[PDB]
C-alpha cells in the first residue's frame, strides 16, 4: 500500500530491467547517435523519477487512514517516513550510476555535461532529508 511497494521482493531487480529495456529501445533508433542515446536515457529516467516520486501525492487506491498522506508525495510516504532506510538509498545510488555511465559516454562534452547534470540535480534536491515537507510555492 505504497509504504511497502519498494520494500517488496525483486522490485529492485525489476527497476533495472525497465531501464535496461528503455536503453535497448533507445539504442535501436535510426537517426540517432550513440552519445545522445545516453543523453536521452539519463533525461527520461530522471524525468520519471521526479514525476513518479515527487509530484503525484496520495494513493491510486483508497487509504483507510482517512487520507493522511493525501498531501504527501510518494517519496515522503515511503516506509512511514523514516528516511535512512534500505530502499531509499538504493533509489539515490542508481541515478548516480546513471550519471557516471552518461559521464563515460558522450566523452565528457560540455553540452552533455550541462543537460545531464540538471536532471541529476533536480532529482536529488528533493531527496534531501531536510527537504521533507517544504514545497516551492505550489503543489
Amino acid at each position: 500500500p505504497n509504504t511497502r511497494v519498494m520494500n517488496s521482493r525483486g522490485i529492485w531487480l525489476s527497476y533495472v530491467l525497465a531501464i535496461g529495456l528503455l536503453h535497448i529501445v533507445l539504442l535501436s533508433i535510426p537517426f540517432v547517435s550513440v552519445p545522445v542515446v545516453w543523453t536521452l536515457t539519463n533525461l527520461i529516467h530522471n524525468m520519471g523519477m521526479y514525476i513518479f516520486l515527487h509530484t503525484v501525492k496520495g494513493t491510486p487506491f483508497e487509504t483507510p487512514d482517512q487520507g493522511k498522506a493525501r498531501l504527501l508525495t510518494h517519496w515522503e510516504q515511503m516506509d512511514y517516513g523514516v528516511q535512512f532506510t534500505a530502499s531509499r538509498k538504493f533509489l539515490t545510488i542508481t541515478p548516480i550510476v546513471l550519471y557516471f555511465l552518461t559521464s563515460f559516454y558522450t566523452k565528457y562534452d560540455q553540452i552533455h555535461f550541462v543537460l545531464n547534470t540538471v536532471s541529476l540535480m533536480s532529482v536529488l534536491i528533493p531527496k534531501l532529508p531536510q527537504l521533507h515537507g517544504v514545497r516551492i510555492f505550489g503543489i
Binding site: 525483486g10 525497465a18 496520495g58 494513493t59
Partner: protein
Amino acid sequence: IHHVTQNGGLYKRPFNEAFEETPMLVAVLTYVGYGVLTLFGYLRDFLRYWRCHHATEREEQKDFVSLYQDFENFYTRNLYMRIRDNWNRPICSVPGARVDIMERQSHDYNWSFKYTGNIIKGVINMGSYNYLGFARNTGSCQEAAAKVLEEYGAGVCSTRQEIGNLDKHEELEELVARFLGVEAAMAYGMGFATNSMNIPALVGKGCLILSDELNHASLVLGARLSGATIRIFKHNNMQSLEKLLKDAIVYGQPRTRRPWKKILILVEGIYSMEGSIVRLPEVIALKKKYKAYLYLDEAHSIGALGPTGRGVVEYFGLDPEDVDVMMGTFTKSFGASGGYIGGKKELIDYLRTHSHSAVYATSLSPPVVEQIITSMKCIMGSLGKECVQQLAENTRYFRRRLKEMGFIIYGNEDSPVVPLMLYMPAKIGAFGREMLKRNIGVVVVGFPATPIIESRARFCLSAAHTKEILDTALKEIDEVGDLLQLKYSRH
C-alpha cells in the same frame, strides 16, 4: 510434548506451516503486468477530457468543491472495473455444497451488467463460510427456528438496556459460557459491530495496543476509535513480538516517559487470507512474562479447531482461563448472524454496562438465536460432531493433494482455508471466469487487499463437501493450473 523451543511455548503436536517464498522469475513478470496496466490508466483518464459511462456528478445546481479525489479512484476503475465480474455474483439458493447462481454479463465491458434469465445450477462452491455445513433449509436443526419465527417475530424494536431483552437472549448468553468453558458470555448483533464497539470500551487514552500486521478491518477500527497508541508487530513473529513488548515497558509514551496505563494484544485464531494459525502457546508464555493482556478473535477458529471444535484453545489443548477476552462470530461456522464475547464475569458485567451497543444498538433477531442454539446442541450432543472429524479429514486430504500437484499453498496444513497463489493480475481475471466455466465458483483476492505479489485465490473447505464432491473439484483444477501454468512450486 513436541516443542518447548525458547520462549517456554510448550507444544504437544508438530506445527508444520509452509510459507514458500515466491520465485524470482515469477515476481518480475507481475510488475510488468501492473506496469502495462498502470500505463493505460493515465491513457484512459487523459481520454476523458472530453465527453463506460460514468456516474456524472449533478450539474443542475451543484459544482462546489468536487466530492471525490480522481486519483484515489485510480485502481478501482482501471484494475478493478476491468475484471469485476467475479466476487459479486448473485446466488439464488442455499449456500451449501451446490449453489444456484444467477448468470449475468456486460456488453459495456463490465461497466453495466444484465441478468439474462439463467440459473447455473449444481455449482460446487468453495468460497462460503460454511465449515460445519449448517447452511441447509432441511433437517430438524433449522426447523426449530420456524417455531420461533411464527411465535416471536423477526426483531426487537428496542435495546438491551432498554426494553428489548428476551429470555432467549438470557438463555444464549448462558449457553456459550458453558460451550467456551468460561464464566460469562454476551452476544452482539453482528461480528463486525462487536470489535468496533467494545474494544473502545476497554482501553483508554494511556493504553498501548499490540496488534498483528493483518488482523481485519474490525480490529483496526476498534483500535482507531479508542484513542490509544497502536503498534504493529510482524505476522507470527514472537521475536518481533517480544522486541516491541520489551521496549514497550522499558520505555513509555513517546512524549512523556510515564508508564503505560495498561497494554494488550489483538490476535486472531485463523487468519482468513493466508490461512494460518497463530503460535498461541508462545503468546500465552510471553504475556505472562510481561504482564500484558490478550484479546483473542475466534471468528474463523471456533467450530473449526479442536475436537468437537471449540476454537484454538482446545486445538492447543490449553485453558480458556488464560485468555483475558475471547471473541468469535456465528456467521462462519454456524450459518447464523452475530457474534459474542466470552470472558470473566467481572469483565462481562462491565461490558453489560459500558457497551456502545447494548445501550444504543438494537439486539439480535429472535429466530437466528434459535439457529445458534440448535447448532450448538448438535455440537454438544442430527448432523452433529462427526462432521468436524470429516472436515479435518477433508482438510488434511485436500492440503497434501494440491501440494503434490505442483501448486503453492500457504498457511498451516491443518487450516481449512486454502490460499492458492496467483501472481499475475490477468491470472486473477481469467481464473474466476475459467473455474466458472468448469462448474465451480471460487473467491479470488485482488491487489489492494493483499500485497503486490500475493494476489491469491482462496478456498473454503467444508464438512458438507464429501469425497466425490471434493475429488471432482480436484479434477477441474488439474486442467486449469496446467492451462494457466500456475504450477509455481518446485515440489
